[model samples]
Target chain A: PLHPYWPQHLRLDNFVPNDRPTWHILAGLFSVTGVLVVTTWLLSGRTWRRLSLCWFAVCGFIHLVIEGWFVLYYEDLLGDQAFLSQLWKEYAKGDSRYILGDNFTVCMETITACLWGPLSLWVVIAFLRQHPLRFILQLVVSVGQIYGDVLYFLTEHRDGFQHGELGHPLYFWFYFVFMNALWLVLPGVLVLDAVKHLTHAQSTLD
Target chain B: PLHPYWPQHLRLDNFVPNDRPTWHILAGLFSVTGVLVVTTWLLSGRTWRRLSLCWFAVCGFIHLVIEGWFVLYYEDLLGDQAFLSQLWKEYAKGDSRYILGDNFTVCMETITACLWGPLSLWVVIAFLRQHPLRFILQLVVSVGQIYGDVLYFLTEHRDGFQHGELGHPLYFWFYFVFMNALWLVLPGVLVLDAVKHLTHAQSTLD
Candidate 1:
């Protein structure tokens, strides 16, 4: 049997235990597309700038596809067993709001899927083309990711961290805190980096 | 009697009615701080740039001081008789989430009060000095405001627009819809403006 989620008295009778093993589910997160993108860039150059392109491209997939899955079927998740639904069922163990259809989660995910998803990819391509718009898109997208992620953490924090396995090594530390921190710390660095790029560019003029 | 809000049976027994008339509260919003900022700048330059300084200064007040009030006491709003409490009670008629302490509203406001509030004021000063960092801060701050405001509307939308009178011209249309639209439209313009500026800066180099 799987470990139980918190607030156990809250009914989730329809929740179906995962058929896939924990390692199988974890393995799927890094499976193919992003790995290929990173490999292609890695073969050529190791510049910090080029790696950001890889980062946005990978983030684009997660925001557009993976998180997109949650936004699409958050309500039907408890009993549903489609691959994507099943995928979310596993992750929801880290934060039950995905299964509960919590309003904040629903709203936050929709914006993530719609705005940040496509925009991240645009930043990738824009940077490749050396489009002037690249830095602007980078600054805005990074800010959105950080802001939404902060709200995601703070709301849970305010609620006393009652969602999943509050401090279970893998579930809480890795999935909950560490997974979310990527969005926070990476985007945070990109925000400052964009600031420097734009500042230097502007200072050159006057 | 004040017109009824939506989801009418949602209990708010401790809810105290507004002491001041609606007009008095509305008038209070525009009475002094922002008006003086606008007038002082109007005396010197009619250029669009100086006026934005006025806009951000005004927005700084609303985001930091006014919205800041909501974050400080969202839990105690139902029966509190303080002026800011009365102020929110009047405004919450447009969206009951304010009084309900809904997780999204609470989290969204805290970020606004904390991040957007101070940054907006900083952008005003930064722009005043024509700092190289000005465009970067403007770009980031505008995105946050738009992103947060969009979620504010969407969450309410997904809830079936159930808050407030649904279509009461004063409460619903003016207070709920129009008041919030300012955040979307104004920031949207600023976002584009920053993009043009940073884009110009980069293209100048190459």
Candidate 2:
């Protein structure tokens, strides 16, 4: 039997119905600030390892608390109609919510929360403490996180634009692409950063 | 409108039917030999980078010629009933082919053939020529390949297993997982191998 709370179809009646305008804008600003700080940090860093670690720490925490919360709450939101789910339907404001709903999303969301989310934190912690296995962990975490992002992009592409609609350009650019791009771009940098450390260690041994 | 030739449902009446036994076994052996040679090289190589380069060269060629050919031919096969498509349907022996058919698989296969496939060959050629951008290229190629594999796995998972029935162990383990695993696992090694070189370069400058 299908789960009771599984999102049946994409509906767009009250999309972004302005339930919590303050929280929504605040969240948006918080995201903008986070991206700003990270971009600036990347531009000025001398030591790759330290910069990478700091970036991982910041991104990891955000994924864990912010995205992680969404992963956990999504199912519950579906069950309690006319509230979080309806609000989400509006807030998402895209055809994806209608096409995919919670069916296909639940799997990736859980993976993000349980695996990639914690991995960010763990990689940050390991790198900071200079653990012996830190280099390998960094590689794993970076690759895994990047993998998550890549998977999301491909699946989203398959799900496709909601009825060929682009949604609001501001929200689309800032909230969707701009913010998510950081996770992919930075994690890629982090992987390269780790590789440098590993190769250095190899050179020393040789 | 859906393509008429698209595989609508998976039928197992003549599973591994003797339609193209020679070609079927030949392809199987081709893959088996390919994996064996790469595994042997990895075990014997003194320098990781050289071994990784060779591995990429071999796999890239195989992907381009073998899997790439399939990507190109699959659509054509669908159009002609008594040709390769009929044979493939028997050989594939899975529900994914029917469920996703050409819709989703076409995207990923083209990515595998066109993007990831070319990347493997390019990275090999670049590193071999000892180019300055080789390091970054290797990183991009590795990450991109890994992303391709990651995307394939996730989408496959979303497509889900064929009605709770696992395919034959030999086909599943050897043909399916064994062949696919090389792309994922070896590229992972290649990424680390590149990292070692990058770090060595950094340490020298310092």
Candidate 3:
């Protein structure tokens, strides 16, 4: 039987494989370029100071593009054939918790995509170009990511009434818990690190 | 008949007067305090300079509190007796576009509430306390407000697929268009003004 909550437009029970073909391709492109950017910076003998920030920037870039694609699809700004939407549908076949059909999640994604996604790219460019406001921008981006992730989890828990059963602890632990936690933990660390730089810089002015 | 989209917990067809008692009370308290704060600053002959920022802070403060209430209600974080939810439901009786039922919009409210609401208050405190990073904080808060409002209207339009019918042009124009547009226009102005301060501040370093 078809999922009760499948969006009216999709109306299909069968899974569509290779959904999100374009997103996958674009993700690959950006990931490759991101690696190249980081590696080049590393080889140039940049101190651990800038090197760590580079790594942070690359991760932010990849995360933003993926999120950006989903937001586009969620808003129907992009067609159903879009990678994230189709992939979500296929994944929904295995689990109904994908949130694609939810108006609230879609709305959140749209804002995050438009706001944080570009901000993610800006973080990368700021560090690479050594923008004057890089430290402040980094702090904002990191805080924003943490805030979004916190909200996402809160809504997800409330709507589902609790976390869903993954049937396998490994998948649950890895995908649901570990992966999601990383965004919060990592961005939090970045925020702290950025604050350190900001604090140090402010000392000079005093 | 009760609206199908009304949240299950509410289960009421009739209006719930005094829905937002706590919020209303707090709003009154803050607004009074804000006026007091502004008058004190003005009387001190603090120039039109800090006076404008103080006014901006007060508006931001009030805006954040109202938004904070809605976010709380939306997330079920606040009691059902909250004003914004009741207000939306009552408003929903007249028009179904308030998005009380939509998960996406509700989720957006939560984050915007959590993130921007506090940021608004922080703007006031930052300036009042002469925060070391006050300029940067103001820039981010103003820019963040602009981004949130823009995304709000965009999602609002697409989700409804069109603007809701104008039951009365006066109400529609005044409450709907005017109030909403003010957030965007005013924040946009604040962001530009903040940018000027930031640009000048940065140039001094060179």
> Evaluated with TM-score, which candidate comes out highest?
1
Tens-place lDDT digits, model 1, residues B23-108:
77667776867585867487435378687777888888888877898989876754345567767877877755677788778888
Judge the docking of candidate 2 as incorrect, acceptable, medium or high: incorrect
The residue-by-residue lDDT of candidate 1 on A1-206, one tens digit each, is 33366666568767777777778766766776558576747743537878788888888888988899888888777534556777777777775567778877898999999989899989987887558888888988999999989989998888888888677887788888898999999999998898888899899876
Rank list by lDDT: 1, 3, 2
Q: Candidate 2's residue-wise lDDT over A1-206, tens digit each? A: 12111233434332233455445556764776477457646543526555666666666655665556565565444423433344344335432342234433555555666766577667766555555456555666676666566555565565564322355464455545665677688777777866666555544432
Instruction: Candidate 3: give the TM-score of chain A.
Output: 0.69
- Model 2 lDDT tens row, B1-206: 13221143434232323445546655775676577457646543526666766666676766676566566666444424443454444335432353233444555565667766687767766665445446655765676576556655565565564422356464455445666677789778777766666555545543
TM-scores for chain A over all candidates: 0.91, 0.68, 0.69
Worst lDDT run of 10 residues, candidate 3 chain A, spans: A1-10
DockQ of 3: 0.21
**TM value for model 1:** 0.93
Q: Residue-wise lDDT of candidate 3 within B1-206, one digit each (tens)?
A: 34323233444444334445445644666577678666757744545546656655565554566555665554342224645455444333332345444554566556666666677667656666456566556656666666556656666555563334445353345445665677788777766665565544543444
